[model samples]
Structure formats: structure tokens, C-alpha cells
Target: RTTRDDLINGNSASCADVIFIYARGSTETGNLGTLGPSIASNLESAFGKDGVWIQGVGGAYRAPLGDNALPRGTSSAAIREMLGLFQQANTKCPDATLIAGGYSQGAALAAASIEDLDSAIRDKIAGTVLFGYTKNLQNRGRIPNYPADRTKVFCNTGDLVCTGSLIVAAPHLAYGPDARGPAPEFLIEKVRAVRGS
Candidate 1:
């Protein structure tokens, strides 16, 4: 039986072709919903499941409210924890390809943490996919050190979360199913481009 620690540690003896770090939206239990699992599914469909390891950041279930919110989703602790996970995975598999992504608050976390990561580690990241990204951050929440061509961001036509018009509820949930079809193709091609380079 695989344990949570196994996933976080990326306990594979040999480095996988890619390590997928997926952060789920705020308050979403487990890691199967939204774009994370969808992207993982697509990669598994193409890669036969052997070369991809999907790891989700746990303990990030706080609701996007009260005193702790924004910048890094719920709190800076979430970003720290997830960044630690990413660093650990990279420490374990330095040469493996890295793909990072998230939805809503999760996307916020990914965008912020990428800037703080070591340049060497950041270079290993081949692509990023963000859905319902919060575009209200300072400087428009740019993802540093990640290539524009390899990054795919999806915002629904009228989602308030991305536009900062409102945050009534899960208005950002619109992109999960919609992004499922195209995300893999873009991600796969990005990986190919990275490998070629």
C-alpha cells in the first residue's frame, strides 16, 4: 500500500521522467478534483504511468477567508509547506522533468513559490498550468523563471475570482472540465520541447 509519505518523498528508486506537483484549490479535500488529476490523467494516458509521479500538497484545506488569505492561498504556511514538498522532490530527483500547476488559490501558491525556488530547481520545471488564477496580485502575479510558451493559464469567460469582481463562492470551478481536453496536449508538447533542449 502506498502511503502519503511515499508520494511526498517521491520514493522511486530511479528518477521518473517527470514529477508533477499539483496544488488543489482552497478547501478542496484530497487531490483528485480540478485540474491536477485531470492533467495527471492525461499524462498517464500518454506515458503509461511509469514516468510520472503526481504529488499534491496536503494541509492546504483552509477556506479562502478570515485573517489568512491571498498571496499564497489561505496563508504563507501553505506556500512554505508546498515549496518544501517541491524542493524535496527535486532533491530526490534532480534530473527528472518538473511540471507544476494548480487552480485558484492553488494557482496562486504555484506562482508565488516558483519565484522563491532555487534557480537550478526552477530550471527543471518544464511547464505550468493554472486555472481560474487570481489575477489581482501585485504585479499581476507573474510566474518568474517559467517560460511563457510552456505555461498554460485558463480563466472562464466570466469567472469573478480571476477578474476580482467577486468571490462569492466557487465561481472559479468552471475551468476544471473545460481545461481537461486541451491541457495534456499542451503539457506534452512542452515536455517534448524541454527534453529536446
Candidate 2:
């Protein structure tokens, strides 16, 4: 069920300095959304093409159909899968710095992974960047154990998904262009610090 091997295309598994885990926003191409790809693009630019590994996480459709709200169960399943994939990556490249990131609902899942991953693996994570994380969920223990200094969560001022209800969609569209600018710098510094440590 883990597609870690196929999704990773940029770097040789053994020598890459960082492994980037990306989860796309709801209903977007599960693997390649504007937000995740933009960050991956900036990462490659900052760290060279062969210096980073990309892992995409996807699961059941998160869009609403008729009257049904987005399904929590499906998102949870993806989170669990991401956890296992992170473990797999750690087993495969214990020396590589780990960076997990996501957009919208995917951001929630990324936060969960950071919070729930085993301490050994979690301790080695360099950073996590969440774009437009749900506001209500932010206060929960979703990010308890992850390194606060290394984690960066970006929410557009008007983005209601991060501040209000999930039904609001306008502000959610504002992250890609803005995030692409500084996210790479943040990750690069964090990854470098982790490697140095």
C-alpha cells in the first residue's frame, strides 16, 4: 500500500540529505497539488536535484459529495499510512533528515504524523511545514511532541479553514504562491541543523 519507492524520484536513497513527505489538499491530484509541488520545487532549487527525496501521501477522496461532509475516516487512514511510510523511510535511510509537510486536510495529517511517530523517528525529524491547517484542530495535541522550533505552520490571514469552518474555500487558495517563497529556506536551515546535530 505504501508507494514510497515510486514517488521518490529526485535523489539516490542512500545519500540524500532530506526526505520530504508531501500530502496534497482535498480533491486535488492526491499526489501533486499546487501547494506540495511548489514546496518540492523550492526544495530542489535550494538543495540541488539529487539532495532530496519526495514521498507523496494520498487516500480516499476528501471532497464533499451531495450533503456528506468530508470523511474523517479516510483522512485518518492516510495519516496511518504516512506513519508507516515514515518508518519505512527511517529504516531505509536512518541518516537522512526527515521533513513532513501538507496542505489543508493533508496538513492536519502531517501534524498528526509528527505528533504520533515513535519517539526515535520523531526525534530525528528536521521539520514540518503545514499550509492552511484547520484552525480548530490546531489547538489539539496534534503537535505535542514534534520540535516546535522546527515546525512551521502557515495560514493566510483570511483563510477560514485555518480559522473558521472547513466550508470556506477562498483563503485556502492563497497559500501556494506565498508559501513557495520562504518554505524552502525554512526547510533547508532545519535540515542542515538536523544533519549538523
Candidate 3:
């Protein structure tokens, strides 16, 4: 099942050379959906026109997963679905790239999904963009090795969602030579570049 509208659109679009795994917020299932026009405008300005948004619509502590309606296993299950989507995309277009992006809880789930991926499939990954997440530098020291230039993290130090240790660790995990900062719009650009657009 599809979570976000953008994912559905992206999956439906025959023109897309690559796939984007969007990290969504609490309002939806997995924060699934496109950045839409407004967000896309900002993204386009920063990253270029190749950006295609597709978000995960369901997950823990969010709508679709809210009010304790669904089982706790749904969180992991949603990530499994996302991985399966990646596999499906690869099967259909072996050379096409896959970009995984997440925000808030979605970011945490995306990271876990990458960690759990089969080494072979994981290697197929083009990049990961984690936005507004906090840090545990000691915990994420190993993150730098993943995707290297293909991976980037965006954090707003002033935003409570990304402060203190999280701010410290986010930059370390990003693809840029420098550390974390605000570049939420850049997520699309980096992914487009990673996917070789």
C-alpha cells in the first residue's frame, strides 16, 4: 500500500529515472507525500529541477499510526514496505538510483532501514537525507562511512528539533565536507545529483 500521495505519483510517473523515499512528519502515516509546489520551489532553487518527491506516509506516533490504533509492529513494517519498494524499482530498472530521505521520526526509521538493508541492496542506495534530527555523536560516529558524498543531513540548531548533541552529530553524518546546518531544501538537489540526474 502507498502511504503518501507523492509516492504514488512518483511511482506512477514513467519518466522518473530514479526513486525517492521521503521521510514524513506526524500528520501522515510515514510523513509520506511530496514537498509539493511550495516546498518544491525552495528545493528547486537549491537543488535544481530533477528533484522528485515521494514520502513515506505511515509510521509510529503519527496519524495512520496514531491513537494506538495500529500494532506497534507497524513501524518496522512500514520500513519493510519502503525497502520492498526500492527492490521493486530496482527490478524494473536495475540502473535507476534510489534516494532515501526522512524527517523527525521518519528520519530515525530511514536510518534504521538503511542499517538493516542487505549489504548488496544497501550498496545500491544512492543517498540518504535526514532532516531536523538530533545527535548522539558517539552513537553515530560510524554514519560517516555510509554513502559518504551520497549522504547528507540537515539540521536547524535554533529549532528545538535539532539542537545540542543532535546538531553536533548531524553535520558529521552529512555528505558535504563540513558539518550540519540548515539546508532542508537542498535534500532534493543532493538526491538528484546522487541519482545522477
Candidate 4:
């Protein structure tokens, strides 16, 4: 029930020192779906509203819809637009520290988005945080070459998507506004130095 927050691509009035670009799960509207805002709100509280901006990847591709009973592999569009936002921040918010994040279906996009990022722009990214990660359902870990310390993935213990199942269950939907903790800790502590901690 979280309202959408589309700062990156939206006509936001201001650009700040911390820019978080997020992608929503499937069928979710406005990019920053259910869990996306909760994560950003926590960061906003930590850093203050004027210090941060939120961006959403988008809802442009097709869902699996029995195409395979599985979510499609990472979208080329997702990856492409994600890099575009990073580049957008490079100039628009030149002094900002960037973060890439997504939830569930959106998580895959954010993870894959980093695969082809230009290292010149990529280095500006402070880190990545995503919840309800779907790839873990297949026992895979962080995407290769992404720094371990800079990445964070959270999935509820009973989540069907992360526990090796295609079935949708309560666990998968459990990471709502309430339990959005683990990564905010990382977001605050890890990137504090960037803002002169």
C-alpha cells in the first residue's frame, strides 16, 4: 500500500547528496512499490529529506504469465535504464553518492543492472540493497564481481521465492514496511564516510 516515489525520473524539485535508484516488483506500479519506500524512508530519516533522492526503474516489460511459470531473466531494459539513471546522477546530482536497490522481481533487475555498468560511473555507487531476492530460490548468491561488502540481500526464512520454490506464499510478501531493517543499518554505517562521517 505504499505510494509510489519516483524521484529519479520524476520531475523532482531538488537533487541531493544521496541518490537511491530503486526498481519495483512485478505488477507493482510507480517503480518504488510496497517495500521500496519503506527502505528509502528509513534512509531519509537517517539522512534528512533534503539529503536524499529516490528513483524507480520502471514497469515496462512483460511478466512471465506461464511463459515459463518463472520470472523472465533480467530485463535488458531494466539494466539499460538503470545505467541511464546512474549516468543521470553523474551530471544532475554530480556530488551525490549512488545506491541501487530493488525488491523481489525488481531485485533481479537491480542485481543484473550492475553487470554491464561502466566502471567509471559504477565507482560512484555506494552500494546495493534489495529484498525478497528471487535468485536465492535457486541457491545462487551475489552476482559475480559485485563487491561482497557493498551488496545486501534479504529474504524471509519461509519465503518461497528464496527457499527454492516457485510458489508464492506469505513469507515472500512479509518484508513490507515493518521489517525493513538489515540494509538500512548497512546503508547508514557503510556509507557514512562518503558524507563526511
Candidate 5:
């Protein structure tokens, strides 16, 4: 089971020891969605209640309409929004260990957002986690210039979404429960490695 379910929303007072910026899947309720909250849940357990702060990227995720089969770059509002969140998160807490992620269409948002960020902001993105990542096959499972070592992607087998297929199926829906452990652990390890505590 998971621990947290609310949206952090990334306000000015969002500073914390570990910060997570998330973009929800298309049509998923609330900003954090199912998987984002689960990831947030497990993350707080590791970092303690107040040590973590999660910000849900404020974008419609409705690129022309609800994650429909379409090429990218046309609907880049989420990407732009996530880019700003990254900058804002760093500004609010310069030393905070930052993580970014999304699921399904939201994954594409996070992937694209990282491309335009300055290297300094990218440095704060200690980790990037994606579930049912729509761009898994397109970018060859990598966000250019963002270190692959700092990213943890969850793509269930047979999930067409990750395979670059527009066919949404059961596989894509199963990632919520699967996001609890390793996803946050990946970011936690990096922060601990640097903080050395």
C-alpha cells in the first residue's frame, strides 16, 4: 500500500529536504494521479513526513484532447510548465534533492521539460521517474543531456504505451502499486551519496 495521496502543488513555501515535481497522466483525477501519489507516498516514508515536498505540474495534459494519438511538440504546455517548476523548486530550496517524473502522457511532459532546462537546474533534478512512459521508444528511453543514471523508468511488460503504441490497455494501468519502492530509492541514493549522511 501507499502512504500519501494529496497534491503538493509546488507553492513558494514548498521548500524541503527532498523535492519531487510530478505531471499526472491524462484524465487522471487530481494533479498527482494514482502513480504520482504512490511515488510520493513511498518517498515520504524514506525522507520522513516533512522532509519531502511534492509538486504536481499544473498542465492540462490534454494535448489536443486527452492523450490521443498525436505527434508531440504541438501540445507542449505541460513541458513548459514543468520547466518552470524545476526552476522554481530550485529557487525555493537550493540544496534540496530534486526529482521529476510523470506517467503516460505526463511522462512525455517530464521528458520534454528536461530538454530546455539549464544545466544548473538539471543538476538539481537528482532523479527522474516515469511510468508507462509514452516516449520510451521514441527517445530510445532517454532524455537527451539528462543523465540516464539519474532516471528510473517503470514500464510493465506488454504495456503498449511504453512501446510507442497509442493503444491504452491494462498494462499501463498497473503501475500505481508498482511505484512504491525503487523509484524513490533511486533518488534517495543519489541524494545520500552527495549529502553523505
Candidate 6:
């Protein structure tokens, strides 16, 4: 899914000390740009010059290689691939921090990448900023909990995006507000705040 020309022409190289990975949802549904601008705006407002935005996006409606059929964060292969991508991205900016972020399924993938990867690779991770997502504990109870060390998830109180009404294990039924996500400057600010943590 990656190409040399894509890399060479990519403007991601212009971003600063931080890498803002965009969220990607189910392969079956293509990309979900739900409220992205507002979220990005908020991040920019919060981070400013301390960080930069790197949108992480891609996937098919259904992938044949891994388990993209189950649910968010349910497939190990997808997680591994994402982690590998992050590692590769970091090689381009060894001195900067790498932040794995997403929304909805993308958020779930980001969380899984953080929990499943080697601790050393995980350390390079600055933080995770997620919007519209359900919290998954990876079934083993070894991963998720409240007061995240370097992660923040937002649920729209009235929006059922991450409520998991379809799957009952999760009880949370709300996604928080981003105040400023769509605006570029605001998005940068939000990233800066997380980078400092």
C-alpha cells in the first residue's frame, strides 16, 4: 500500500518535532473523516510550535491478510503492521516523538499498537489522542484502565460512536468535545499539549 513516489512527494517531512498519525477505521468502510478538522484544530491550538501533524490513514473495506473482520483492535496482524509503519516513520525523525492517534476504529488500532508492541518501541510513543472510540482491554485485562499514562480518549456524550451498543462489554456511551479540531492552528495546539506530556 506504500510507494517510493508517495514517500518522496509526501509533505509529512515538513512537520516538526511531532508526528500526528491520523485515524483509520474499518477496511470495509474506507476512511472516516468524522469531525476531523475540529479535532485537528484543537490539537494545533494546544501544541503550537512544539509539535506537527502527521495524518495516519488507509485500509480497505476488507483486508485479506489479517483479521479485519472481527472489530476494532481485534486483529493482531493489523496492529503489527501499524506498529511497523510507526517505526518506519520514526526513522525519518529520530529526534522527535511519535504519537499514534486515531478516531473510532483508528483510535482502537492506535491503542492496540501501543499495547501490543515491544516496550522499547512503545517508549518512543509520546501519547495517544483519540476521539469517538470504544475502549478495549485486549481481553486479557493486562492493558487498559482509566487515568491513561499517555493516552486521552474523547466520547461524544450523546453520540454512540464508541458506546459499543452492538457489543456489550463496554459501558461507556459518550464522546467528549474537541473545542477546536477542524482548524489547523487549533489541531497543532492540541498535539503540542500531548507532546509535552
RMSD of each: 3.1, 4.0, 7.1, 3.1, 3.2, 6.2
Q: Over 4 Å off in model 5, which ranges?
A: 1-14, 59-70
Better of 4 and 6 by TM-score: 4
lDDT of 3 by residue, 49-149 (tens): 45444445343335232411222212666667666666655555455556666654555556666766776767766666665443313225223336556
Over 4 Å off in model 1, which ranges? 1-6, 60-68, 71-73, 136-138, 169-171
**Estimated TM-score for each candidate:** 0.84, 0.82, 0.59, 0.82, 0.86, 0.61
State the lDDT of candidate 6 residue by residue for 1-197, as single tens digits.
Answer: 11111212345556456656555544323332444444544554555633554444443223231432356544656666677666666666665665656655666666667666767666766556665554533322123532255655565555444544334223232222452432333334444566555
What is the alpha-carbon lDDT for the whole of candidate 2?
A: 0.68
Q: Per-residue lDDT for 30-104 in model 4, tens only?
A: 667677777877888988877777777753533232321334445666567777777777877676788877777
lDDT digits (tens) for residues 1-197 of candidate 2 = 22333334433445577788877666666575677767777788877767777778754324222211334412455667778878877877777788887777677667766667899998877888778876334454246676568878787778776665566568778886666777767888888775763
Candidate 5 lDDT, tens digit per residue, 84-166? 77777777678787878888888888887887789898887877888888888888888878988887889999999788787
The lDDT of model 4 is 0.69
- Two-way TM-score contest, 3 vs 5, winner: 5
Candidate 6 Cα misplacement greater than 4 A, ranges: 1-15, 26-32, 41-51, 59-74, 136-147, 158-164, 167-197
TM-score of 1: 0.84
Error (Å) of candidate 5 at residue 187 is 2.4
Q: Point to the candidate with the largest lDDT.
A: 5
Between the candidate structures 4 and 5, which one is better when assessed by TM-score?
5
Q: How accurate is candidate 6 locally (lDDT)?
A: 0.50
Per-residue lDDT over 16-132 for candidate 1, one digit per residue giving the tens place of the 0 to 100 score: 777778777756667634456677778878666767777777755353544124444446777787778778877787778888887777777778788778888888888888877
Native-to-model Cα distance after best TM-score fit, residue 15 in candidate 1, in Å? 2.3
- C-alpha lDDT score of every prediction, in listed order: 0.69, 0.68, 0.48, 0.69, 0.74, 0.50
